Ligand binder design. Structure first.
Ligand SMILES: [Mg+2]
Ligand SMILES: [Mg+2]
Lengths: 66, 116, 78, 181
RNA sequence: ACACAUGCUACAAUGGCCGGUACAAAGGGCUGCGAUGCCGUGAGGUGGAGCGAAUCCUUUCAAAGCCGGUCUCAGUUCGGAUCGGGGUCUGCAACUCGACCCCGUGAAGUCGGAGUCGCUAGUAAUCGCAGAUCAGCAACGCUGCGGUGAAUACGUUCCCG
């Protein structure tokens, strides 16, 4: 690494909404970062819901009734 | 008062005040404010400093703070875009999402009535 | 608000049909609605003015009228 | 800490998992991440000389390094360019600076990829190297939403010593890289 | 997607939002207007005192304006077209095809150039009305039609008859 052409570095605590906490290095000088996703893949549930959201023939029938 | 970055009305029912956001509907705002305790009768001008803090803290549990919904929806769409589900390529090329009209109507999604 | 048009012309026919418990095509100019569950199990003849397209029936199908499936025109792109 | 959390968990969990799944019959033959490079793309050049500096600043505070700019290797007529003009930036990360970047990515940025629904596992080259493109910009919590002026997306790729594509696929699966089939 | 027309909605501080709030001028009702109250956020629904009527019904019956809270001069909280969906309405029939409230997406338009047009006394604007024509609604254009209330005036030289 060079002398000072890069930003500073300091410990960083990343706290999530559900209560989870991570510790890692970053560039934020505040030392604490609030995030909206914990160590759990909400992507999984989002995909599980939107794979069901699909469907056009079932919708046409569900509307048809006859 | 001010919020985390979204502008809200002053004397409109809390439901419509929070629904004015592009990503929150009327029923969504109602069911979100009910859990926090902000009845739909009280207005946005008579709120307390803690009523905004509790609202922000709750809209992170089930739903997402304004900036968080902004960092949800667009790349939600972008992921389901090709090679994802057919709805992706339906939304990309500006095509009826649920099979709306194409020529005679549905000009809202197709664009303005250009003077051609 | 599940009380829309009753479509008596088709209600009487499906009644006389379920009185015998058969599954046949109801030949009638019924292109109005099939809201009531009494229409389930039986088949009808859509009258959009030009022709008819048969379809199968079941129980989980509730929510539209009888003619709003495919318009009087056809969508093919080219 | 001495070693980042990502490397700490990798060196044992992912190593033993990869070994038990594809026993290479010799140590040091297990695929291990070599380097992760982020390429900030441009091409509006010849019309604005400030967006390049803006994108450099964007790559800054996202990667703890000084992004290096690439110059046009050849002038093009259709696309207005010129030999020697700065077109595009990149940042290469390796070691602890790569592990921290990757862990922060998988933990915030991917979740910050707006409502991340998954990624296509077909984005793999012939030698087990992954690549994925961030569309608009700033999928991290380091650049302010108000400071963000215009979308300047980029690409991020990870290169490892994987002989085949299945090796890199399994490595990323063991890692926090969710895939969708 | 248009050349055009008696020509709504609007373009905002002489404007908007909601909770509350007074007067009157003043048509019609036998296969119809339709109240206290219960059902709804809304088109509406089971029901019906009253009614050939200065009564009851459009409720004891609106608003501009009026005393309070606010936006602080902007494609916005004014503006509602279009759209997906709950649908309501009268109709055997609301799909190519009517009217309406509501959940959401939220467009031209920042008082419009050359030009053209109404108007001297309760006249043209700034808030209002509908019966029959319909079983059903385009009805915001019509046939009848209340209220508050100013501006100006050298003369027919000038365009038109
Ligand atoms: Mg979380
Ligand atoms: Mg008639």
């Amino acid at each position: 690494m060079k002398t000072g052409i890069h930003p500073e570095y300091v410990d960083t605590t990343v706290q999530c909404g559900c209560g989870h906490s991570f510790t890692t290095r970053s560039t934020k000088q505040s030392g604490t970062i609030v995030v909206e996703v914990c160590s759990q893949c909400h992507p999984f549930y989002t995909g599980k819901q939107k794979i069901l959201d699909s469907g056009g023939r079932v919708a046409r029938f569900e509307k048809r009734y006859g | 008062a001010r919020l985390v970055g979204v502008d809200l009305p002053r004397d409109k029912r809390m439901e419509i005040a929070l629904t004015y956001i592009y990503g929150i509907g009327r029923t969504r705002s109602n069911e979100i404010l009910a859990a926090t305790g902000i009845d739909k009768n009280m207005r946005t001008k008579d709120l307390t400093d803690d009523q905004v803090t509790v609202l922000r803290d709750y809209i992170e549990g089930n739903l997402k703070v304004e900036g968080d919904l902004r960092r949800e929806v667009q790349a939600d769409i972008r992921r389901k875009i090709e090679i994802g589900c057919y709805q992706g390529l339906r939304h990309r090329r500006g095509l009826p999402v649920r099979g709306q009209r194409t020529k005679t109507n549905a000009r809202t999604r197709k664009g303005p009535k250009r003077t051609i | 608000k599940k009380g829309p048009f009753v479509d008596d012309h088709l209600l009487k026919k499906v009644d006389v049909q379920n009185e015998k418990n058969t599954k046949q095509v109801i030949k009638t100019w019924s292109r109005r609605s099939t809201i009531i569950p009494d229409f389930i199990g039986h088949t009808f003849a859509v009258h959009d003015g030009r022709k008819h397209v048969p379809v199968f029936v079941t129980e989980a199908m509730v929510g539209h009228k009888l003619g709003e499936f495919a318009p009087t025109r056809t969508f093919k792109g080219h | 800490k001495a070693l980042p959390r990502l490397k700490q968990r990798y060196r044992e969990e992912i190593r033993e998992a990869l070994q038990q799944e594809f026993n290479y019959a010799n140590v040091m033959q297990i695929p291990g991440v070599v380097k992760v490079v982020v390429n900030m793309g441009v091409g509006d050049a010849a019309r604005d000389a400030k967006l390049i500096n803006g994108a450099i600043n964007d790559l800054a505070l996202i990667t703890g390094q000084k992004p290096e700019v690439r110059r046009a290797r050849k002038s093009i007529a259709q696309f207005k360019l010129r030999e020697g003009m700065p077109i595009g930036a990149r940042v290469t990360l390796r070691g602890d600076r790569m592990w921290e970047f990757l862990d922060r990515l998988i933990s915030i940025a991917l979740p910050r990829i707006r409502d991340f629904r998954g990624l296509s596992p077909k984005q793999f080259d012939g030698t087990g190297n992954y690549t994925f493109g961030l569309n608009e910009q700033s999928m991290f919590h380091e650049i302010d939403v108000d400071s963000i002026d215009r979308p300047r997306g980029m690409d991020i790729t990870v290169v490892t010593t994987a002989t085949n594509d299945a090796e890199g696929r399994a490595l990323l699966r063991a890692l926090g890289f969710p895939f969708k089939e």
